[PDB]
């Protein structure tokens, strides 16, 4: 009977008048928060004026031109080429086609294999699911399609053995070199990864990881792609997660965080090297020119402008981010069954564990996470479980009072969670 | 710089006040025509009120519920299960995954091959391009992905030899039986086809074709899938092209015709048998419940309501359709280098040919269509060239005056085109 009635800021309300804290910002994407009535006006105006632009005209729709110009002001130097899509999933599928076409154009038609990671998520298309490494997605299908390979994820809690996180980062990155050499560098087109793995559980790699991944890609002349599905548009305090981790990808993909989810959209941001190679090839020219639904572009422009002009991204970096990260660690580090408390900017997580001292996970990874999640939900807090990882990505506009409000509810729920563990003898 | 400034009804206007006739309704999809300010109000209202619906609630967004209920009132019996997407390309990719999962659930994981047609078009994803039969899309890669096969298209003008269209329909459909038997029925999941091939040049199959295709699919336990990317939402005078051709697909895919292109959207309409088979599996349940961007759904609802309530689809069947078809044939049948004048409802075409009597096509199929297309554009009429086929699919609301206006401009260009052939000695 429970229906959602409205949203404002970080809150949702139901038909019974109950306030719900959205600690996940819809699908990790409602970065400016709920209730942006100004976006509705942007959509209305664009649709009344010119919701279409026909290819009969050799020019680009002014709404799309304006969006691309704003994006160029906020994206790293050298990403003047943007190919618009309808979603993060389509962005990934397009990027796969682009990376393969680039090598064809270069006269290296064998260079077609993309390398991803286990527990990596890259959307839901046949191609994206194949690049992804989600156990259940490959489990129930014909995946992966040819020319896809996977390396283990940089999850220190599980795989670190006796290494420090920094030592482990180097070893985890070197799995890419090992895989490139196993396949043959001349068969490898790209490595693709989320700066922080989102759906996998907010797996935050060690500081040593991305620099070594980047060194390895450059050494073997393999393209480097960041999937900014979740880290894009201010989530880490930088505009894009790759900026936080300090690597410089050749292309990066974006999902509906581009519009804070208010209309469906995505994009592939294409760097100078690949853009020039594809422009010589010619078969993405239609897309580079005529991609982007004008009404969706108008909403995304309003959203990106708000992110910049209202100082929202800067505020994550300098203000609410450090506050959230400190408070997050203060709140959860004391629990007997919580470990690997982690996060940066406005994405954060922890893992529910059987025994901290032994780094021992619960068996049937996910059962305990579901149990904890159900408690959060009963208490009108949205934070999700990915296996036994608990994850949070609230709207970036969250105030310190709202941070503290959310944490107080979560803290109460964790106390309940541990009581239920003990009472069922699983502790 | 020639820029588009506005659209109304069947007309587009440029920056220099020129009135252009859109004989193609955007991407074959602007079915209610341009200037629908009421669609803008629907989008505004939905975005102000509730543009999101969170999975925290186990209910469906009211705008999506309302859209699905309306669609069920106009779609064929048995398609109560709809899975929304952002585009026709995503619909196809989703449909491929569904068809494969359905057989997985039935305990037949070997039944994975989908059969399409040469010159068939099913969107731009890796999966869709592989199912499609566009030669250039394939060799611009290492498509198709595995588990895809193709049969020849039912194009009588080229492949009919000395059969009548109806004899040829049976022959062209039996190519499917041949391919199923070659592969083995136990390895074949589905046959997929556009009721009329759109991008392939409005190839209209003989009346005998679809019933034979259906007989074959049912005999060999192969699913039958209609791609309604272009035939959908009133184009043939029926709601869907499969209804015109009198076949019952097990699933069918839709593109942004669902919203007349005003916002990006698509859908997979899933028949009772496949829906029941998937609901047992459980892994499209999230999509079946939570698919559909609510703002896009509100615009699509307004569009589908207008198509029904303003009598637009019925008018194609009983009124403007017959008129267009009669006038089209009256206008083009007389020309020396025009043959196979064809169409139904508001989709129509012809083929530019070297010699009618010999059914001889121009060499380098495409050069000639382009030169005819160029004349059309110079005279501010948008009709598309697919190889040497000239195609038209105007907004369904086009009036008799506008039909005659359009054909008058087309006639002048064809009168011109043939004069230009001789002057080059290509005639």
Author numbering:
A (entry chain A), B (entry chain B): 33 to 459
Sentences from the paper on this structure:
The crystal structures and inhibitor complexes of two industrially important ω-aminotransferase enzymes from Pseudomonas aeruginosa and Chromobacterium violaceum have been determined in order to understand the differences in their substrate specificity. The two enzymes share 30% sequence identity and use the same amino acceptor, pyruvate; however, the Pseudomonas enzyme shows activity towards the amino donor β-alanine, whilst the Chromobacterium enzyme does not. It appears that the different rigidity of the protein scaffold contributes to the substrate specificity observed for the two ω-­aminotransferases.
Attempts to crystallize C. violaceum Am:PyAT with a small excess of PLP (100 µM) resulted in the structure of the apoenzyme. C. violaceum Am:PyAT elutes with an apparent molecular mass of 100 kDa on a size-exclusion chromatography column, which corresponds to a dimer. Significant structural rearrangements accompany cofactor binding in C. violaceum (CV) Am:PyAT, as also described by Humble et al.. The N-terminus (up to residue 36), which is disordered in the apoenzyme structure, becomes ordered in the holoenzyme structure and occupies the position of the unwound helix.
